[PDB]
Amino acid sequence: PFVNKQFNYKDPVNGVDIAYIKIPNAGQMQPVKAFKIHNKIWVIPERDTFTNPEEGDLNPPPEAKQVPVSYYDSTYLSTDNEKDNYLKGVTKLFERIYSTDLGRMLLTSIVRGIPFWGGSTIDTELKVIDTNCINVIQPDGSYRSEELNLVIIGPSADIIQFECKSFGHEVLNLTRNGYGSTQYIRFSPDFTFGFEESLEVDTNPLLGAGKFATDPAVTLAHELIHAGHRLYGIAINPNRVFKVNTNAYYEMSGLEVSFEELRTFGGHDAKFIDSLQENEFRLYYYNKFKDIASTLNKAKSIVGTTASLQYMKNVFKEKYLLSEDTSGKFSVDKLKFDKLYKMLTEIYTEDNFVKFFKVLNRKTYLNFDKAVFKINIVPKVNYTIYDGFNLRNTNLAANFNGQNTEINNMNFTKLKNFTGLF
């Protein structure tokens, strides 16, 4: 299993994989109880009022001031039972993802994607960037710095606004300069979204109530794909967007969708990024990897005593799949770069995960959400690592009957309809 411990939220802290921690939000905060479910990966069963100090209010603004696709509930994830269920739900989803060859590949890439040690101001020394760490309270009450790659945390005010968040740098654009940074994914396994089986209905903002439910493992995988891009510092600048001209409803509102999202979904959506611009990005990141190779060559000493210089050099030699010559100099091989870049951007896509999970899912990112449902994937009678909602040897096994909210209505509670609100 990906997670070797079936944690309970109430398990006593041990200062190792169950501990109170603080994140580098450049601000103050009370320690929060977190769980390390795998090497380099932690889960914080709390609403995210930490990564952004300006987003500490969970209370919903006045009803006359709320947008379209959003859902508020300041009480969600405030009790121990909810946190226990959150932890178990997120864990089950990691196992579902890991059970597929593609998920195993993606998770392996994420674990190997340690954020680059580029915090030193002296190019002859390698130093870790402290915002890619968390401070863990040890048994003696002292804090120890631990590097990590991924943190799954509860959503902020808008419960359904799932997304990757990471701490930036004063000058370096960590998610776009090949370096990478610790990723905090705002996510919840307790809600899911409804979509429509007919393409003409799903991509229309005036039709459909959301008959089918998105499998939450796909939603998490989508975020993990973004995390992968960001951990390897190859995320596409959000200012690079596709001025949608394939959907009259998007067009009439001048809606734009970032290339990063189209790339992440994959399938035909990825084709909206023309060859010229795609080549531009590839060359850009190829160069970024070259800088990392050179920075490693200029490194003559390492800061800290946790790991040795040769160890960290090998860590990044493996992450970026660099080549080493006779003198021990590092360099980027075009074939290996192209292979890794392609793996992270074309192999790991939402569309491909749908093929592995054998579930029904939106056919394109360019659609309109229909509704949000409350769910509970923790009980095996509701959802399993192997079949998600479509339980084998039951009436829900075929035709995605488990995702059919009308047939499997006992597993879904519609909280809000979005159709017509655009």
């Binding site: 696709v69 606004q161 999202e261 990112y365 659609n367 309109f368 655009f422």
Partner: peptide
């Protein structure tokens, strides 16, 4: 991010 999920999107529209």
């Amino acid at each position: 991010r999920r999107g529209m």
